[PDB]
C-alpha cells in the first residue's frame, strides 16, 4: 500500500500543466514513420548495405579537392532563383544531391545527420574532422593529405558530432539535428526526407500575395525561401509532399495532380522546412545556408 | 577538431542493429495524437474541469461499499455475451463506464490510467492505496478526537484495475482543492493504433496487414475465447464492405461493452457487443484485410 502526497495547485492548473507540457515524443521522429522505415529497411538490408559501400565518399588530394568544393559553392551562389519543370530540368544528379539521404533516425529516436567516408588504409589517428561554419571537413595523413569537404547544415548539432570507423573501414560521422519539423516529417526511400504541409486555422507563415519563389530574410539576418502556390482545394495535406535536393525544392501533390520545383543559389536545410496549405493556397518556407 | 574511434562492428551489423532497435517512441503515445489532444484539451479545459468535479468518486463506509462492488461484479459475470443496438440499448450510464475515460497521456509521454476521487475532509496521511489482484482499493480513516486512540469507521472505494496497468508504479496525489488523483502507466498498450477522442475515449484503429496476426475462426459475431491457463479474451469477426479503409473504422470499449464504428465518404455502420467481463481496452488489436475485420481484446474480472 501507499500514501498520497499534497500538490500545490488545484485540479484545473495541474491539468493545464499537462496540456502545455513538453512531451518527449514532440522531439522524436513520429512513430508511424519510424515503424514504416524499420519495416522496409530490413526487407532491403542486403542491397542497401551493398549500395552504401558502393557510394561511400572517397578522400581525394586535399587542396585540389577543397578548391573544387569551394568553386562549386561559389558557382552555385551565382544561380538566379527560378522555377523549373521538375521532370525536364536538373534531371542530372547534382553535387549536393546526397544531402537528400543524409537524414536518418538514431537509436535515441531523434533525427540525425549521417555521412559515410571510405577510410580503407588509414588509422583513426591519421584522421582529423573539423566543422567550420557550414562545412564538414575530413582530412587524412599517411604522402600528402587526402580528404573530403561537404556542406553541413546549420541545424546539425556541432556539440554532439560523433565519429567512428567500422571494422570494414567505413568512417561514420553523425550528429542529431536540432529542432527539425518532427510533426511533418515523412521518411521515404525516393525523396529521402520530405515534409507534409499542415492544414491550420491560424496561419503561422506570413502570406504575401506573391505567387511563386521569393527568398526572404529570417528573423535574424539569415536567408530562407518563401513559396506561394495556388493549388486545387481538392488537395488534402496528406496528398502533398515538399522536399529538397541540395539547392532545389520540389513540391508534389496527387489525389488531380501537380508537380512544381524551384532552384535557389543556396542549400536548403530540409528538416526545418514548414508548409501550411489552407484555402487552396499553400505557402512553404525553409532556411537556406551557404 | 575531433578524432574518430575504431568500432567493434562492421557497417551492416550496425545497421541491422538500428533497424531492429526498440525506439523510444514505440513506447509513447503517437505524436499527432498527443498534439491534437493538448490542442482541444485547452479549448475545453473549463468544461472538462466542471464535469470532473461533478463526477468524482466518493468514499463510502468501507465494508458496505466493498460488498456493493463484489455484488456489481457478480451481476456482471452473469451477463450473456451478445450484440446489441448501440443507440437503443445500454443507453443509461453504467457502473464501469468511467473506464472509457480513465486513459490519458502522462508527462513521460506514456499512456496512463488515471482516476479521481473526492477526498475532502481527509489528510493525505489518513489515506491508503493498494492494488489487490485486479482491483484498486482506496481506504481512509481518521481518529475521533485528539488525545484518544479510537477511530471513525473506515470509508473507501474500490474500482476495477486492468491487468495492463503497472502495479509497481502507481502514484497518488491530493490536490489543493481536495481531489485525490491516482495514476499509473500502462504496460505495452497498442501505441501505434491508439486514437484519443473525447466521445470515444480510447479507440483503436485496425491495421491493414499482409500477414494476419489474429486468427480467423470463420464465424461472424462475438466470442469469448478461453485459454488453457484460464485467460479470457473477446474475439470479434465482421465482414465489412470493401469500400471501408482501415482509417474509416474505430473500435473502443466502455467497461464490458465494445463498440465498432465505420464511416467512409457514402456508407457507414455501427455495431456493439456486451460481455460478462471487463475489457482491457488499451491492449485491443484489430486488423481489417479484404472485407474481414477481426478484433481481439483481453478480458478481466
Swiss-Prot record, chain A:
Its main location: cytoplasm. The keyword Transcription does not apply. It comes from the Eukaryota. SUPFAM superfamilies: HSP20-like chaperones (SSF49764). It is found in: Cytoplasm. Pfam families: HSP20 (PF00011), Tsp36_N (PF20894). GO terms for biological process: protein refolding; response to heat. Keywords: Chaperone, Cytoplasm, Repeat. GO terms for cellular component: cytoplasm; nucleus. GO terms for molecular function: unfolded protein binding. The keyword Ligase does not apply. InterPro entries: A-crystallin/Hsp20_dom, Alpha-crystallin/sHSP_animal, HSP20-like_chaperone, Tsp36_N, Tsp36_N_sf. CDD domains: metazoan_ACD. Gene3D superfamilies: 2.60.40.790, 6.10.20.50. Disulfide bonds: none annotated. Transmembrane segments: none annotated. Residues 94-190, 206-290 form the sHSP domain. Not precipitated by antisera from cattle infected with T.saginata, suggesting that the protein is not accessible to the host immune system. Belongs to the small heat shock protein (HSP20) family. Has chaperone activity towards unfolded proteins (in vitro). Homodimer and homotetramer. This is Small heat shock protein p36. It comes from Taenia saginata.
Amino acid at each position: 500500500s501507499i500514501f498520497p502526497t499534497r500538490d500545490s495547485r488545484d485540479l484545473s492548473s495541474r491539468r493545464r500543466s499537462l496540456i502545455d507540457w513538453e512531451f518527449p515524443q514532440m522531439a522524436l521522429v513520429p512513430l508511424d514513420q519510424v515503424f514504416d522505415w524499420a519495416e522496409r529497411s530490413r526487407q532491403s538490408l542486403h542491397d542497401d548495405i551493398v549500395n552504401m559501400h558502393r557510394n561511400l565518399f572517397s578522400l581525394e588530394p586535399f587542396t585540389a579537392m577543397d578548391n573544387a568544393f569551394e568553386s562549386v559553392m561559389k558557382e552555385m551562389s551565382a544561380i538566379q532563383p527560378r522555377e523549373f519543370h521538375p521532370e525536364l530540368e536538373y534531371t542530372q544528379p547534382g553535387e549536393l544531391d546526397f544531402l537528400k539521404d543524409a537524414y536518418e533516425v538514431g537509436k535515441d529516436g531523434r533525427l540525425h545527420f549521417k555521412v559515410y567516408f571510405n577510410v580503407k588504409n588509414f588509422k583513426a589517428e591519421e584522421i582529423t574532422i573539423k566543422a567550420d561554419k557550414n562545412k564538414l571537413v575530413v582530412r587524412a595523413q599517411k604522402s600528402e593529405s587526402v580528404g573530403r569537404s561537404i556542406p553541413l547544415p546549420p541545424s546539425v548539432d556541432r556539440n554532439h558530432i560523433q565519429a567512428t570507423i567500422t571494422t570494414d573501414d567505413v568512417l561514420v560521422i553523425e550528429a542529431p539535428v536540432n529542432e527539425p519539423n518532427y510533426k511533418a516529417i515523412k521518411l521515404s526511400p525516393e525523396k529521402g526526407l520530405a515534409i507534409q504541409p499542415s492544414e491550420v486555422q491560424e496561419r503561422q507563415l506570413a502570406v504575401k500575395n506573391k505567387e511563386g519563389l521569393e527568398i526572404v530574410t529570417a528573423e535574424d539576418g539569415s536567408k530562407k525561401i518563401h513559396l506561394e502556390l495556388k493549388v486545387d482545394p481538392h488537395f488534402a495535406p496528406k496528398d502533398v509532399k515538399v522536399w529538397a535536393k541540395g539547392n532545389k525544392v520540389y513540391v508534389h501533390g496527387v489525389t488531380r495532380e501537380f508537380y512544381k520545383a524551384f532552384v535557389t543559389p543556396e542549400v536548403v536545410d530540409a528538416s526545418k522546412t514548414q508548409a501550411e496549405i489552407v484555402d487552396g493556397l499553400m505557402v512553404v518556407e525553409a532556411p537556406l545556408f551557404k
